[PDB]
Structures are given as C-alpha cells and as structure tokens.
C-alpha cells in the first residue's frame, strides 16, 4: 500500500537553563528509525531501527549536522515568537515542526507536507501545491512574507519531491523484512458481568502491524454503535500494536453480537462471537 | 534524510 516518511521536531524553551530542549524523531510508516535529543551526551543523530545501522559515517555526520542546525533555527524562533506575541521571558513555550512525504503503492510521490505550530496550535503550513502557505494569524503572516521573499517553498518542494521520496524508497528496501512485512492481529473475546441486567463483551486485537485497523460491533448483522467503547490504538513496545472494542449488552443476548476486524494483514475480514 | 542544509527562521 502507500507508505510515509515523517520527521517530528519539538523545541521547548526553558527560562533559567542555557538552552531549550530539542527532540527530533523520524519514522517510516509507524516505525521509528532515528532520534536526536539535545540533552543526551552523544550530541549525534542516533539509530532506533536495526536497518539504518548499516549506513556509513558520511550519512551519520550529515544527519547530525542537519538536525543540529534545525535546533539552532528553533532556538531563534522561540525568541522571535515570544517577541511577536509580547510574552514574558519567564514562561516556557513550544515550537513543533512536522514534515515528510507520502508515496503510493507504486512508490511514486503522492504528497508532501510541512507544518509549524507554536504552543500547540497551527502557525504556518505549506499548502498541497508545495508553492504557497497558509498562515493562522498576523504574526504568521509576517513569517509568510519572509518565507515568500526568501523562496523557502522552492527549496522544500525540491526536498519533498526529490530527496524525501528517494530515501524513503531506500529505507523501504533495506529493512524489507521489518517495514514491508505484516503481522495479522491475534484476537479473542472476554466477558464481564457489569451488573445483574447487563454484561460487557470486549473484543481484542493484539500484536499487529501496521497500526491501521478497524474494529466494529454488529447486532444481528446491523452495524451499531450505542454503548460502544473503542480504546485508542496503542503500542505494545515490540513494534506491534494493540486495540480493543467493547459493548455493553443485555444479559442473555450475548450470541446476537458480533465483532468485525479489518487489517491489511488479514486475507479476509474476521468475525467473532462470544463462544459459550 | 532530513531537509538541509537548514530551515529558515520564522
């Protein structure tokens, strides 16, 4: 199917410390493969997936130089934005930046993006054409003017359509057994008396990859979602994910409810009923 | 690969 490479950068100002905290992470699909943390002793971009450890010293010197340069830019952006909003130098503030590219099933370029937030809300963003910007407010409008005068869209377009996409393809091939490979969910149902007149059916999907998954409850074949809970998808810590969906039911009507599971690792969708 | 050599200030 389609695949992504995304990098996430967070910078937090710290009044009374010398530098802001900067943290950078990169993913391919739902798999993390690198990190940088300004507070760690290494001061290098560091591998987090076995298949990037094979890249040589030129790769790691470059990635580290670039990611250190992003932290220096956010260090200045923190002071500029404090100024624009006339904020006290006493408070902690956040910048976040996310960019990357998607690629289709043919591995050709689908889309590219670049978003920037201040204190958890949209500040500036590249539109889908990769030639223009959306700005949230008058401070962002000033940056927009700056970035238009400096031709930042052109630089980024070239990276997103060239470099981003190419190295994504390259990471897909190296680590094929990790990234391309699919773990179907291991499933089961539990049952709980919640009262004297009611009972919970909980449908589990365990140990799957990737994380996209759809869990639904039908009653007598009729998709329905009243007194349903589906928990947020969660990492197991091994590179796999977990999720459940629950329904509260009249005591006795157990057999009438069915749990449907869709995951690209399943040949055909799975159906489950409470067994006894 | 990250974008480089570097981004521009806001």
């Amino acid at each position, epitope marked *: 199917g389609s695949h992504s490479m995304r990098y996430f950068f967070t910078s937090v100002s710290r009044p009374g410390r010398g530098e802001p905290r900067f943290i950078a992470v990169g993913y391919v699909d739902d798999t993390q493969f690198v990190r940088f943390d300004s507070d760690a002793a290494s001061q290098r971009m560091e591998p987090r997936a076995p298949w990037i450890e094979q890249e040589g010293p030129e790769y790691w010197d470059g990635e580290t*130089r670039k990611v250190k*340069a992003h932290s220096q830019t956010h260090r200045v952006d923190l002071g500029t934005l404090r100024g624009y909003y006339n904020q006290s130098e006493a408070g902690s503030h956040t910048v976040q930046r996310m960019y990357g590219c998607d690629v289709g099933s043919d591995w050709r370029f689908l889309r590219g993006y670049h978003q920037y937030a201040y204190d958890g809300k949209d500040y500036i963003a590249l539109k889908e054409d990769l030639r223009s910007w959306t700005a949230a407010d008058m401070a962002a409008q000033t940056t927009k003017h700056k970035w238009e005068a400096a031709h930042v869209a052109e630089q980024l377009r070239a990276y997103l359509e060239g*470099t981003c996409v190419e190295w994504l393809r390259r990471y897909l091939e190296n680590g094929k057994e990790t990234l391309q490979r699919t773990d179907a969910p291991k499933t089961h149902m539990t049952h709980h008396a919640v009262s004297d007149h009611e009972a919970t059916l909980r449908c589990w999907a365990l140990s799957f990859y990737p994380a996209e998954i759809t869990l639904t409850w039908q009653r007598d074949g009729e998709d329905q979602t009243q007194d349903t809970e589906l928990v947020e998808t969660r990492p197991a810590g091994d590179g796999t994910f977990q999720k459940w969906a629950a329904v509260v039911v009249p005591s006795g009507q157990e057999q009438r409810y069915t749990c449907h599971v869709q995951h690209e690792g399943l040949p055909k969708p799975l159906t489950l009923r409470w067994e006894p | 690969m990250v974008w480089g*050599p*570097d981004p521009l200030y806001v």
Partner: T-cell receptor
Amino acid sequence: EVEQDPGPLSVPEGAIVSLNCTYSNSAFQYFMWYRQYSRKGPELLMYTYSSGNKEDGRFTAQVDKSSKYISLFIRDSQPSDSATYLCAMRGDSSYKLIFGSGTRLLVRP
Amino acid sequence: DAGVIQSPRHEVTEMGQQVTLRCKPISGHDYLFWYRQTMMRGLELLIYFNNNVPIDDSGMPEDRFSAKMPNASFSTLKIQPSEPRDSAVYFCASSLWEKLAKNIQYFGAGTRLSVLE
C-alpha cells in the same frame, strides 16, 4: 573532488571562451563559477541548481549532472575578463563549498 | 555599507610564533566562513560558523589551527606554532540564509600570510 584544467588559456579579444570542470560525487547539487583577479578575492558570476543552462549577458553556465560535467561560456571576451576562473560546488547537507584548482585566462587586447 | 573587514591585511612572521587572523562579518550576518588559498592554486573551506557555533570543520587541519567566534561580530583563526607550509591568503566571508540559498556570500579582502624559515 573537482577536476579543472589549469590553462593558461590565451585568446584574442572578441573570442568565445569555454571553461569547464568535472566531478565524481553525485550528491553535488549546486554549481557556481567565480572569477578572481590577480591578488584579489573571488567574485561570484553564475550559479546553477541541479541541471540545465542559464544565460546572463555574455555568460552562459551549463550543468550536465549525468556526465558530471559543467561549463561556462564567455561570448565576446574582453581584456577585463582576464582572470582566474574557479568552479565550486556543494550538496544539501552543508554550506561547505568544494573548489576546482582554477583556470587562468588571458584575453589579449 | 561596510563589507567584511579582515585584519591584518599582511602578516610576515618567523616560524614558531603564534599567528592571529581576524574577521569582522557584515553586521546582521549570522554565517561566517574561513577559507584558505595557496598557489597550489584553489580555495578550500577551513570552517564555517552559524550563530557563533562551528558547523563544519572537516577542512580544518588536525593540529595547530583553531577558530573561534566569541561574539556575532568577531572571529579569529589562530595558528600556534606557525610553519612555512601555512603561508597562504586566508579569506573570511559572511552571509545569510536567503543569500546562501542562491549561493551568495560576501568576501573580505583577505590576509596574505608569509611564515618564514
């Protein structure tokens, strides 16, 4: 690494001059030409990103990324074009420029 | 309208002594580059700085050479001890991101250094 023939090139006023450079590293994406007068700093003339051709008055710069070959043409050369011409390039991970060793050009009045 | 200012413009010195080269970038510029040119004929980057932090120093000789930028208007390149093979013209340049994106940088007039046997 960058290869540039040192010359010296001696041409008559009005002549078209051709300077060029080869490289090996396919990560280079920006290509520049500089001129330098005797005992002075280098002055940028033309710059190119990725591939193609660029005209500015008497100068045309060209880049063929597949042959890894780049060129500068000077139409209607003049006595004041006499200088050393250097090519330089970089990729996208650093502002570090790599230079060729330069070509000395005399244009005879 | 001042450009980059380099000092001294000329330096003649006996090997074994300390040599100091200085550069004042154009004010407002946050990138500063030190290059070297010997009549082994072309330029080579020694180091560049951004916001006074050194960014790439792969061209720095492994010994005797040290560059600093103690504030945004002043950088120093020092050689202790100097040797004849260090004779060169040393150029300083400064720029900004948006000029560097079209590969423009602004060059000092250079320091011409002769270290003598």
